[PDB]
Write a protein that binds this ligand. Structure first.
Ligand SMILES: O=C(CCCC[C@@H]1SC[C@@H]2NC(=O)N[C@@H]21)NCCN(Cc1ccccn1)Cc1ccccn1
Ligand SMILES: O=C(CCCC[C@@H]1SC[C@@H]2NC(=O)N[C@@H]21)NCCN(Cc1ccccn1)Cc1ccccn1
Ligand SMILES: O=C(CCCC[C@@H]1SC[C@@H]2NC(=O)N[C@@H]21)NCCN(Cc1ccccn1)Cc1ccccn1
Ligand SMILES: O=C(CCCC[C@@H]1SC[C@@H]2NC(=O)N[C@@H]21)NCCN(Cc1ccccn1)Cc1ccccn1
Ligand SMILES: [Cu+2]
Ligand SMILES: [Cu+2]
Ligand SMILES: [Cu+2]
Ligand SMILES: [Cu+2]
Lengths: 123, 123, 123, 123
């Protein structure tokens, strides 16, 4: 499967570092370090991936979450990345993400940012 | 914290069932059953939540992922929900979500659906 | 078509007011007044809709944009709503939206909010 | 303002062509031709932009809509792009977009795709 291809250290276009282990069962576990935002050092992440993807040249669907609290900082927010892994010489994880931060109900309409990150195996 | 308030069974507006356990460390673990889509029975989920949220009336940021493969069905896709938990008599988890399915690179522009789910403690 | 059904005044769940005219050619023109945010009084809007939708019970795709500058206020931002009109006794426009605000390149990863608005013919 | 900088022909990463005129009043009008999807030849577009942006190095917020019906084809859908214009030697329009297609109410949870397009002045 893509277990071997996904497991390892990845980098996105902002300079962030995504260290992950793909389990045989479809589990993703690791750490995330963001180069931007209210973030410092490494944060726990967990997620899931398709462990038996199609064999027609389609990518491998996956997703993971980081809550932005660690021993150093708390940003009262969480980001989820949703995307697909694309193997080969230029292996990539192409994602879109949603960052929700805690708000009062009056401000909840403004609680969620959306963006896109592309992860590669080389900085 | 919100550990007690989050842990348990939740229902969204489509009839789906979200069974989760909030850990003291910020972990979310459980199962998801979707009332719609290429889905059948329960699927593994994992995620994260802010375990020390603000005490100013703001909600509690969280997120989780489901890869849509179980023993019965594989839909070559994954959904991430990003949102906040709002406690009280009418407790709610308000989310937006991203569903990515595996595609060829030529079709990757069309690989991601976006939506919103509101979860409540009563069906 | 849905020209008659779309044209008119609509209200969303925040209390905002969406006044629109659907043209025979697929044009949407009107004004938007937001009950929340850095907004005051009415703002110009323009958009487009499917003027020959399917007749199988599917909704009518449409979209529109507001730039958040008028004679009174400038919020250096723009929102686009994308959704479908659903006719009948409980007529609805169900949307998701993207709000982008002007940022420096260093902050561009955080420039876009995402949400969802449901518009009805009654307040 | 950015009227001169925005007006003209733009190209995104898929090969699509975005021809627009920025009006003094904040209007965007033009045509869109998509290199991908259920699309053929040019489609009408309309939108809005911030005509008095900040002068602190922030980008210029804007948005526009295309309904995917012309004389040749009807795809019962509409896309809205929301983003900012960034001037200079490497001028760019960075966007995220929402594509909604008409659906029955039972399938409405799956009606909206999300993505991101970067437009440049050179192919
Ligand atoms: O910045 C963060 C956490 C880090 C996000 C990095 C993102 S994840 C997507 C993208 N990909 C990356 O690799 N990095 C970035 N959360 C914002 C929470 N705050 C709102 C907010 C929104 C925009 C800008 C700054 N803040 C609210 C708040 C609560 C308490 C204190 C301060 N602020
Ligand atoms: O349907 C699913 C999995 C279940 C999603 C339920 C969602 S999660 C968000 C929302 N909230 C809920 O509680 N339920 C719904 N994935 C679609 C994957 N397929 C694309 C697709 C897109 C739209 C409609 C149907 N299919 C691709 C494909 C690969 C192989 C076979 C068949 N299809
Ligand atoms: O608030 C607005 C314009 C009004 C948005 C109302 C939305 S549209 C979606 C939803 N539906 C509705 O009917 N109403 C709401 N733009 C924020 C721009 N600012 C960022 C921002 C982000 C979050 C909260 C406040 N500001 C940046 C900025 C530039 C200069 C000065 C001040 N601020
Ligand atoms: O393809 C389109 C219109 C063209 C979209 C091009 C996008 S806009 C964002 C991105 N940026 C670009 O420059 N190009 C692309 N609409 C899909 C509507 N159909 C769903 C759909 C979803 C995914 C793939 C194909 N179809 C439904 C349907 C109704 C009737 C017949 C056939 N299909
Ligand atoms: Cu912040
Ligand atoms: Cu499917
Ligand atoms: Cu603001
Ligand atoms: Cu189609």
């Amino acid at each position: 499967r893509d277990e071997a291809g996904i497991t390892g250290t990845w980098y996105n276009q902002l300079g962030s570092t995504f260290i992950v282990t793909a389990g045989a069962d479809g589990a993703l576990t690791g750490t995330y370090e963001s180069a931007v935002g209210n973030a410092e050092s490494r944060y726990v992440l967990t997620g899931r991936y398709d462990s038996a993807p199609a064999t027609d040249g389609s990518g491998t669907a996956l997703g993971w979450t980081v809550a932005w609290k660690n021993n150093y900082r708390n940003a009262h927010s969480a980001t989820t990345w949703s995307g697909q892994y694309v193997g080969g010489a230029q292996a990539r994880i192409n994602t879109q993400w949603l960052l929700t931060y805690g708000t009062t109900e009056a401000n909840a309409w403004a609680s969620t940012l959306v963006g896109h990150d592309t992860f590669t195996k080389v900085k």
